[PDB]
Symmetry: D2
Subunit: 297 residues, 4 copies
């Protein structure tokens, strides 16, 4: 007998094959900085914004130690970070089999370690997904090139009616973004997946399984949000310029984990002050210091 | 006797002195494009988002005809556009004396013709300002360099308690943005202003007058909004790159007046189709065409 | 012998509308200065002081207002209009009386160049008293341009304007040096199938006689693209990154006039006054007392 | 006589942290390729095939993994470590046995160069069998660098490292050519007040004997800044704008090896295979059948 009487995060950061070689020969894409910080800070900060404190980072065997050196066990930021390896890039849905013991009987959320988001009320957008305990929640976002993505088709009433992975003739311009919230059904659904035509375990098949059960919520992520492309060297550069323009204008940083932990009340002023000390001689540490004596609405 | 029984817009687009010379020797700043469209499209689109259909464009004598050629009388976009000249750059609050006959007994809103905004729920942010019929509404936005702006000081409860124009030691990092909503008190307040130390009629003195009457609402424009700097050649370039990254990612345009009029139901599908015809051979006209047969949430 | 310059700054049509609905592309700035400063600076660097600016009927007065007669910068500027965009070769019909019996050079008003020894690359073109000189430059999209084909020995053997199947990746740049033959060649041109008097036909005229020098503008040079919104932006970011790293401006005509000895220390000082309170005037004042090699 | 190359790719400290917390700056890409490809390409362009790469203890194995022994690219690469950032002059102590009795050249691992005839600017430096050659370049912020002062006749008369009051806007670039004297000069260096064995002291050693050639790297050259987050970004956008306009890559070592005749058509074909499905491999295959001037 079980007794009745929260949600766990996973970041998939398993590199990018040979696609961005030779730039990425020496290091994983998700460790490349976007402007002033490692790329993985952005998706990590996204889970943190969602209220998620227990997080599994999945990376290659080769680069797990570098992620561990960067991020540690999470204790500096009021988190618990665990690590797992992905020996072979067999697809996104593999995160649930690799993370099966990590997930246990809890709800979960998956984010791609190369996905950057920005916008107003993002916290509330994520909170509504997080609070849907049952079913799956995903986000749809209008893009120029939906053929590159999982694409969501809507009826005249706005109801999601189909999902297609990289269709040659997209039914809409609405791509499914790399942020996914799941209930306790996901690991079993994932265990029963067959590899696609490309020998790959597809997240879109998972989401379609939920859709078929009538348990997929598709929330629109509106045009006033920025979901930044990191798929090409060109988009990477644009991502960096975007973040720089925002931060240099505002004097506020996007996806600074120290700050988000501090505003979530996972760390206090004294602990924030300690995290500042080692980087006091650069703008990043000076930024952390300033946050101790400024009200930011 | 009067009988009881809406809001009018003004765009101040009077160039920028010799500050950006020689770039601006041949044309007004507010006619320079930001990426794919004239700069003035952005603030105009902002008033339109606010529901404002009756709009006065104030510019130099020299460049009024170029604005008129670009924008016409507004009828193509379901607007009414009127024009006035500013012979001498005597300051922002002068818009109310120049626009006194235009404003009549109505509520009003002023936007700077070089101010660009972007973000999620911007429509709702503007709608709440617009619906406050009484008093004045402005927006405060965290910036790196508040000393360049009107700066708003808040007490521990978040109440605005003072305003200072370009203080050497800012009380906060919260700048007052170039978007202002006013009731019928503004023209009289403006008529009674004395020129500042720089022989200039200050908008901050207007706003302070409302603050002193207890009739200033300061709404925070949060960090997830982008209020883009156009004060320098460097910021202008960043503004252009920002818009380009957003539009090329999304396949949706920022501050396309044809689109906003169409979504506000100020023009119909047949009229939108006609506006598309003359630019059918470029991406702008092709964009307008696509909007006729796509649902965009 | 004298060589006169022509800048063609005509219309880009509706192709960049609405950004260019109010004013022509070449009057807009690239970063910190009007686009036209860059081609003008190019001719000045080539040692050319007598220059005809050709633009649309609507915008010629505004070019006249921006640049004047040139005497502030040691130049002798004149102006003319191209009523319709009927081809680049039309520059020599419009500018026939301006050219007279002199050598000539044509630059396109939206073309930006940069690199080391640009002065000497131009000087060597300017020095050829006979024939015509053009520059070929490797580009990813040669189909947009006049395309030069070379034999195995490096010799130019053909030119095709916007070929559907380009013979090489070498584009002819928007800078052309001609001898006294070009007017008579241009006045015999017939309109092409797309309806224009083609500069590539003028160039093929010289090529058929062995009198077209096609010099390679190497990859260490920047010929920046201004044909799209995207490329206009890249040009702004390119000039800004160079200028902010070096503290030296690209295509500042006051500076170029001063280094050519066309204006003196005193005259550059007067030019610095009006913009003393901004970066451009500050730059020009610094030129008075800094040795730049 | 043989000239050997050294690339110093040491630590930037905590100054770019956290972006560089996980891995050193010079292993990160600039646009499409690892930063270190650019300085390596610079030495290769200078005709140097025997090259010692010096990095931090933690990252040397990763440079070893990226570049191998060099034989795929017609190079002979070796590796060594700088345990602590105790000065650029330390390169010659670490690399003493590597250098032996040969001429040498040092490039900083985070320095990017671009422009026309860069090959000939380097070649002329390489050809000087005696003394030392450096390059001076006008910058807005000379206080960050080794600063060269010139008399009215153009002669270098002093060097100051990071002066509070710089004597000119001319910075010494991160590229240095030395004769057989440099090791013996470096082994006599004492640490400066900031605690480093200074390359500027090595250069002043040559200057005191009339044996420092200070050549001007002109404004038509790009020496890009990689010292800040802002400048790293500008470098990426600068390389991208050049490469996308031209269809030609800056500092592709496979290409440079191929043009130097250090690898043949067959060997470049093998190098193209692994990345055939992306832009880099496609670029390299195209080099086999395209004449680029
Ligand atoms: N809004 C925000 C953002 N902006 S965001 O919502 O667009 C964002 C958060 C996390 C990752 C990427 C973007 C941020 O980077 N850092 C923050 O500290 N905040 C403030 C914040 C932090 C925590 C809870 C609610 C609000
Ligand atoms: N949201 C939006 C935007 N984005 S915005 O709110 O950030 C904005 C609007 C106007 C000017 C600048 C930004 C836009 O450019 N064009 C649009 O058509 N829209 C959609 C829209 C149009 C009209 C009413 C409500 C929503
Ligand atoms: N080289 C240079 C340049 N650089 S350039 O040759 O790449 C260039 C010249 C003109 C237009 C665009 C670029 C410049 O902007 N302004 C300058 O004063 N010079 C210096 C100069 C001036 C006059 C003669 C020879 C060299
Ligand atoms: N010029 C050039 C360049 N341009 S460069 O001289 O500005 C340069 C070389 C090396 C590193 C950075 C820039 C290049 O990237 N790759 C090349 O193959 N070349 C051509 C080349 C190759 C070998 C010898 C002489 C010229
Ligand atoms: Cl939205
Ligand atoms: Cl916000
Ligand atoms: Cl070259
Ligand atoms: Cl030069």
């Amino acid at each position: 007998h079980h007794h009745h009487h929260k949600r766990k995060g996973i970041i998939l950061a398993g590199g990018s094959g040979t696609r961005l070689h030779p730039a990425t020969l020496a290091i994983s894409k998700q460790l490349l900085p976007v402007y002033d910080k490692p790329m993985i800070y952005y998706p990590l900060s996204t889970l943190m914004l969602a209220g998620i404190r227990e997080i599994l980072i999945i990376s290659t065997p080769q680069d797990t130690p570098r992620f561990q050196q960067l991020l540690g066990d999470g204790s500096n930021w009021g988190l618990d970070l665990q690590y797992a390896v992905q020996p072979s890039p067999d697809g996104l849905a593999q995160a649930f089999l690799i993370g099966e013991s990590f997930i246990g009987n809890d709800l979960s959320a998956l984010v791609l370690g190369d996905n950057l988001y920005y916008g107003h009320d993002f916290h509330e957008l994520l909170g509504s997904a997080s609070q849907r305990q049952t079913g799956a929640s995903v986000f749809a976002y209008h893009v120029l090139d939906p053929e590159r993505y999982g694409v969501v088709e809507f009826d005249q009433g706005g109801k999601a009616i189909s999902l297609e992975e990289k269709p040659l003739e997209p039914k809409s311009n609405y791509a499914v973004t790399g942020l996914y919230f799941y209930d306790q059904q996901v690991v079993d659904i994932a265990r029963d997946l067959k590899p696609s035509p490309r020998g790959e375990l597809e997240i879109t098949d998972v989401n379609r399984a939920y859709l078929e059960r009538g348990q997929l919520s598709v929330e629109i992520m509106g045009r006033g949000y920025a979901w930044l492309d990191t798929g090409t060297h060109d988009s990477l550069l644009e991502a960096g310029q975007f973040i720089a323009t925002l931060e240099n204008r505002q004097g506020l940083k996007v996806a600074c984990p120290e700050e988000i932990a501090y505003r979530q009340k996972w760390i206090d002023a004294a602990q924030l002050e300690k995290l500042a000390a080692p980087l006091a001689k650069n703008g990043y540490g000076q930024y952390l210091k300033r946050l101790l004596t400024e009200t930011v609405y």
